[PDB]
Amino acid sequence: LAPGSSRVELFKRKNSTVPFEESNGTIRERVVHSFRIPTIVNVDGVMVATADARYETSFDNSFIETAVKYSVDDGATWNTQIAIKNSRASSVSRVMDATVIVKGNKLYILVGSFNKTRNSWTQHRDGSDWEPLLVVGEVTKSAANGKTTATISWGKPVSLKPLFPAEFDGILTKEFVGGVGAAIVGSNGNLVYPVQIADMGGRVFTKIMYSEDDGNTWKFAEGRSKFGCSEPAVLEWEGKLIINNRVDGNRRLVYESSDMGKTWVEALGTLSHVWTNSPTSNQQDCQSSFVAVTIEGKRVMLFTHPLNLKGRWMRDRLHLWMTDNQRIFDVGQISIGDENSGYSSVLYKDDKLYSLHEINTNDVYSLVFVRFIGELQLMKSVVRTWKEEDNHLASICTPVVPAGCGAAVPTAGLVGFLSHSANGSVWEDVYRCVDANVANAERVPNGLKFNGVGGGAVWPVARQGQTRRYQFANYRFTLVATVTIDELPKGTSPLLGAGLEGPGDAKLLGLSYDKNRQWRPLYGAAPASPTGSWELHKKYHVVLTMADRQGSVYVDGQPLAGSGNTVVRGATLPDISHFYIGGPGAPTDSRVTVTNIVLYNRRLNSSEIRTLFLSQDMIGTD
Ligand SMILES: *[C@@H]1O[C@H](CO)[C@@H](O)[C@H](O)[C@H]1NC(C)=O
Ligand SMILES: *[C@@H]1O[C@H](CO)[C@@H](O)[C@H](O)[C@H]1NC(C)=O
Numbered sequence: 001l002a003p004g005s006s007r008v009e010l011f012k013r014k015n016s017t018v019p020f021e022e023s024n025g026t027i028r029e030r031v032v033h034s035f036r037i038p039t040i041v042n043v044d045g046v047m048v049a050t051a052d053a054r055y056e057t058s059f060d061n062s063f064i065e066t067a068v069k070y071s072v073d074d075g076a077t078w079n080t081q082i083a084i085k086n087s088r089a090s091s092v093s094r095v096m097d098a099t100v101i102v103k104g105n106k107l108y109i110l111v112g113s114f115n116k117t118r119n120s121w122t123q124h125r126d127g128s129d130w131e132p133l134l135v136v137g138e139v140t141k142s143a144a145n146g147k148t149t150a151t152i153s154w155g156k157p158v159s160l161k162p163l164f165p166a167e168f169d170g171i172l173t174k175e176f177v178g179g180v181g182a183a184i185v186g187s188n189g190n191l192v193y194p195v196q197i198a199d200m201g202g203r204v205f206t207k208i209m210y211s212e213d214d215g216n217t218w219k220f221a222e223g224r225s226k227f228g229c230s231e232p233a234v235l236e237w238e239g240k241l242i243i244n245n246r247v248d249g250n251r252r253l254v255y256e257s258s259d260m261g262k263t264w265v266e267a268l269g270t271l272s273h274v275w276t277n278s279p280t281s282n283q284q285d286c287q288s289s290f291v292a293v294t295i296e297g298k299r300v301m302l303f304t305h306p307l308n309l310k311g312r313w314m315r316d317r318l319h320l321w322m323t324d325n326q327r328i329f330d331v332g333q334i335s336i337g338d339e340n341s342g343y344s345s346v347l348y349k350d351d352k353l354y355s356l357h358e359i360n361t362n363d364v365y366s367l368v369f370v371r372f373i374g375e376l377q378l379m380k381s382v383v384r385t386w387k388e389e390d391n392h393l394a395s396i397c398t399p400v401v402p403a404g405c406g407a408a409v410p411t412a413g414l415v416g417f418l419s420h421s422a423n424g425s426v427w428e429d430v431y432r433c434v435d436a437n438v439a440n441a442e443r444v445p446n447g448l449k450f451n452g453v454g455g456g457a458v459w460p461v462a463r464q465g466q467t468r469r470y471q472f473a474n475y476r477f478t479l480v481a482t483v484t485i486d487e488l489p490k491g492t493s494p495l496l497g498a499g500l501e502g503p504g505d506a507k508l509l510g511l512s513y514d515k516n517r518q519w520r521p522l523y524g525a526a527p528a529s530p531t532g533s534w535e536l537h538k539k540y541h542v543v544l545t546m547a548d549r550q551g552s553v554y555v556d557g558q559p560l561a562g563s564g565n566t567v568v569r570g571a572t573l574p575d576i577s578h579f580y581i582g583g584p585g586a587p588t589d590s591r592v593t594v595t596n597i598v599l600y601n602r603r604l605n606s607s608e609i610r611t612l613f614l615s616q617d618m619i620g621t622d
């Protein structure tokens, strides 16, 4: 948790009481073992915190009801209710795993309802013990002489089981449940629930379930995730749904849909596979909140997830990340120390940031309500850096080309930039997300001159480790740089490129230079053959382009021979380890100077490339 921030144990295990309604109408304040599966939203000015009240144990297959606490004063005071009762059919009847949408003064809560099974939903023989319940709550804010008040009234649950198809694409269905957490109203006003479906064979997958009529009718859109995806979270970004999935035992898959879920496309060029379940990716995953907000005038996405360094369900070290779909910033750790956390929720309201999330000691759970003061401070500062650098680059007057200013310096898809700030061991991302590691370097305007064994910089890709923010490059990238060759090499020496994980010294795409003053572009595993001519100490503009498994290398805005060649074979995505600049076993000593290294998450077109070539003395940070 950041300095300056703080929290309270709002739903306190074996302590906080909820108004249990006995079968005869009588109401008793009953203690609750664990409070799990939180969501905190904002309804017309009132904070609403929704959660599972697991009365007797933290287990999934036990007696559970949906609790709510709400507040009209930003958390100085809360009222408590049980918003959805379970069926009371057996000692394990439960309503659970709330997914929530806020529209106007209304809340739509979808929960899974179970009567008497003792095993988990994906393991059921059929769907006979199960019902997906939709519940509508309505917020009414009055007040009085100087003090606002509020009530929330909860409707009777409605079963959506009759709307569930028996098959999808021939897949026989068994059960479905909301993806957990806060979902959305689309800009077109649709109610949008990401849902998780279990088929008869116990496979899990996700889909979009939505309403164009404020919840009167619902439709299952045609698309879906791969099998293995669960607890999906969704938000809307630039006219598309982004569906961020839990994936136990592997990296998190993210999809985009431009047609209200009818068709899904893996977000390979942005967010898919960036996040995961643990350092090694082979552990059970955890729910994440994924929410779009506007900070300092800019739309960004917030994502929460544990590092889970302990593994299994411990889910320690809950982090918060912020992304504009290009840069990905780790705001930091919001849980405390090495405590076990778990499921979470984040909410930006009246320019204040909060979280409601689990804490777990010995599998007894509480929900803490957190005021992210320091986090928001850091968020605003980085949003300001992003806006300011983008506006500055977009405002440069570039040379008009023969057919007051030419095309703008491209900023769409601009992910990272290494320019003037640097020291002998770190080259700073102007965008403050991913720095490069440096050795044997001395500073020059807008970059670094390398001299010494291993002189160069490593801009980590897979080397980022657990969270892989440059994962997009395995699908497509543009890497740009301005270089001079300072001293002739003995034979061949590296200048710039994308190296690969694995045995060997392999590259996906790159450029080297040789003792005959020729270029040596590297296209995948093919033998380099020299081409062209350069001169010592002359400035060259270099651009590497990778898309559709193809690579091109440009010098001075013109492609070198071999460009357009296939750089990888097969269906498996490349696994880039890093980008190298200079020559970071063999005692490589590349005597070069490189400035203004720019990284894009897409293949720049030919005229964009020319714009960068013509404006290279204009983009540096100084
Ligand atoms: C519940 O927690 C509060 C806050 O610390 C404490 O005052 C109270 O003693 C607790 N009640 C129980 C049952 O221990
Ligand atoms: C309703 O049932 C509960 C269960 O014990 C009991 O405590 C309560 O007093 C009952 N009230 C009435 C009016 O029968």
Ligand SMILES: *[C@@H]1O[C@H](CO)[C@@H](O)[C@H](O)[C@H]1NC(C)=O
Binding pocket: 087, 088, 089, 114, 115, 128, 129, 130, 131
């Ligand atoms: C669960 O039990 C309740 C109460 O008896 C009943 O109304 C409901 O239909 C049952 N649900 C299912 C899935 O049959």
Ligand SMILES: *[C@@H]1O[C@H](CO)[C@@H](O)[C@H](O)[C@H]1NC(C)=O
Binding pocket: 421, 422, 423, 424, 425, 426, 427, 428
């Ligand atoms: C170098 O500066 C970077 C930021 O430029 C910083 O992380 C580090 O403390 C500095 N010292 C080193 C490692 O040379």
Ligand SMILES: *[C@@H]1O[C@H](CO)[C@@H](O)[C@H](O)[C@H]1NC(C)=O
Binding pocket: 605, 606, 607, 608
């Ligand atoms: C390349 O992109 C620029 C900026 O996106 C665009 O205006 C232009 O039409 C594109 N040119 C080509 C070669 O299609």
